[PDB]
Design brief:
By secondary structure, the chain is an alpha/beta fold. 38% of the residues lie in helices and 15% in strands. The protein has helices spanning 24-27, 58-67, 70-78, 112-132, 152-170, 183-196, and strands spanning 30-34, 44-48, 86-90, 98-102, 137-140, 176-181. It has a 6-stranded mixed beta sheet, with helices on both faces. Strand 5 (137-140), helix 5 and strand 6 (176-181) form a beta-alpha-beta unit. Helix 4 packs parallel to helix 5 (152-170) and helix 5 (152-170) packs across helix 6. The radius of gyration is 16 Å and the shape is globular.
Length: 201
């Protein structure tokens, strides 16, 4: 039997007071899934890391384990990744063709505008890469790691708003965006999805 999670089997948000208008087409591309992003057969899955690409966190731990050691050669070639930027590697043993590696900000209240700008750039640059590579699906992890301390609800507004706006303009080439969540984040995503992706008219 297969060792991965098929994005085709996952129910879409379009199956289940905001400024955003109902948009059936965009809603059909969004998926909320509680599970380990590393299992997904999306074109690319997203790894969240530090500037040296050596961060130990639950997302990276699964991804590195499932990709295997051939990843380390690809990874050194990159020579880090700056806060807010995204970088492509092959997926090696992962079900996904690519990994997009990115680095969220270490959140500090005194740098709140900078943290917002950096997190926004993470999501924007992942999506930029996906468009550039003509990818049909992207599996997002929660880019804000618990250890970097971004307030979860604020972070989730940025994630959903950015994907909404990108899908409105550049959606046609993309079939699915999956927000892979753990129990920690699911409720907040469930809470906010209706605001960025209203279901009724």
């Amino acid at each position: 039997p297969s060792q991965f999670v098929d994005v085709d089997t996952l129910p879409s948000w379009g199956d289940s007071r905001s400024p955003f208008l109902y948009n059936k087409d965009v809603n059909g591309k969004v998926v909320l899934w509680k599970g380990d992003v590393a299992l997904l057969n999306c074109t690319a899955i997203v790894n969240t890391s530090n500037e040296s690409l050596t961060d130990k966190n639950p997302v990276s731990e699964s991804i590195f384990m499932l990709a295997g050691p051939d990843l380390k050669e690809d990874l050194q070639k990159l020579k880090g990744c700056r806060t807010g930027e995204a970088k492509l590697t092959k997926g090696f043993n992962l079900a996904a063709r690519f990994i997009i590696h990115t680095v969220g900000p270490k959140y500090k209240s005194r740098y709140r505008t900078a943290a917002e700008s950096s997190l926004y750039s993470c999501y924007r640059n992942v999506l930029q890469l996906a468009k550039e590579q003509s990818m049909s699906s992207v599996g997002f992890c929660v880019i804000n790691s618990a250890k970097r301390g971004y307030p979860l609800e604020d972070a989730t507004h940025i994630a959903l708003r950015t994907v909404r706006r990108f899908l409105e303009i550049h959606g046609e080439t993309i079939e699915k965006v999956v927000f892979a969540v753990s129990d920690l984040e699911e409720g907040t995503y469930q809470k906010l999805l209706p605001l960025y992706f209203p279901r009724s008219l």
